[PDB]
Design a protein around this ligand. Structure first.
Ligand code: ZM4
Ligand code: ZM4
Lengths: 161, 161
């Protein structure tokens, strides 16, 4: 199935997670653990922002313009992106805002890191309707030496009911 | 022992909790449940802001100026406030910012509601040093129909170790 994974500051603000306060090592470990050996779908700015494929995974880039790197697979539509992942238990949509908004209707699971911090940005995570989603897990953590804000991991699952 | 109870927006901002977004009914129930039948200590603006004693409890007001209501006990110092509570298992310090900063060194427990919201304010909860405190409980909750932001209850306890 299709899952969205994102780190959200207050007001559901997202930004390219090489800036701060998205340099939270705990979120980085959570991200790695939850995307390990799964194909990942991303947009072209996100691809530009990481500079090299995530290792040991099919990396798919969803963009209207022709590809410029043969270490990844380039596609033009959501359905081509999904077909490019093949028959796998879980596809991880990893950014950015426009890619999140195109895959939200097909997604069944959300892996959200709620970060207790304020950042300027126009880019918000899509507005998941509380009624369509059930929170199945959360785990709060204080700020510590490695992590400069408090943060909370959350997993939600789309309701049939 | 002495406990501080407070609702904190992002950046540890606090404000008189009759304004929003401190009108979160879930926080109100958490507050009630954790202060029921315990004496409460508050500052004069907090006392002004509630307009009437919290029922079924000794209400103590810590202020430098003479009292103006005989339904509560007025004191001038921290030690008079604590002595006025008598021999009880738990004293609840309920606001405001200056009262929190005077009782923090004697406190052994903190009941914090972390609210996922931004509010203007100069008044911050004191800067509890992460090393002196252990988080013993947390519980995250999504925004829903009654509660307009996501929030997390937390309890911390002062370390001897
Ligand atoms: C790790 C940050 C993150 N957290 C959560 N919860 N969800 C996400 N979707 C992203 C993300 C992201 C993008 C792909 C991104 C990743 C990285 C990144 C940083 C370090 C590693 C690593 N080598 O482990 C991988 C990717 C860098 C820039 C960007 C724009
Ligand atoms: C309920 C808000 C709150 N939450 C948390 N976690 N900690 C606190 N210390 C306060 C507080 C407070 C102060 C005393 C306050 C309480 C109230 C209030 C509102 C409703 C009731 C009630 N009748 O249950 C009681 C107090 C109103 C204004 C203000 C300045």
């Amino acid at each position: 199935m299709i899952s969205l994974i994102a780190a959200l500051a207050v007001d559901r603000v997202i930004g390219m997670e090489n800036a701060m306060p998205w340099n939270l090592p705990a979120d980085l470990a959570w991200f790695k653990r939850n995307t390990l050996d799964k194909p990942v779908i991303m947009g072209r700015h996100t691809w530009e922002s990481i500079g090299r494929p995530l290792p040991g995974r099919k990396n798919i880039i969803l963009s209207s313009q022709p590809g410029t790197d043969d270490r990844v697979t380039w596609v033009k539509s959501v359905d081509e992106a999904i077909a490019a992942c093949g028959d796998v238990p879980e596809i991880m949509v990893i950014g950015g805002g426009r890619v999140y908004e195109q895959f939200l209707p097909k997604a069944q699971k959300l892996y959200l890191t709620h970060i207790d911090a304020e950042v300027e940005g126009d880019t918000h995570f899509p507005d998941y309707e509380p009624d369509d989603w059930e929170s199945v897990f959360s785990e709060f953590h204080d700020a510590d030496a490695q992590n400069s804000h408090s943060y909370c991991f959350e997993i939600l699952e789309r309701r049939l009911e």
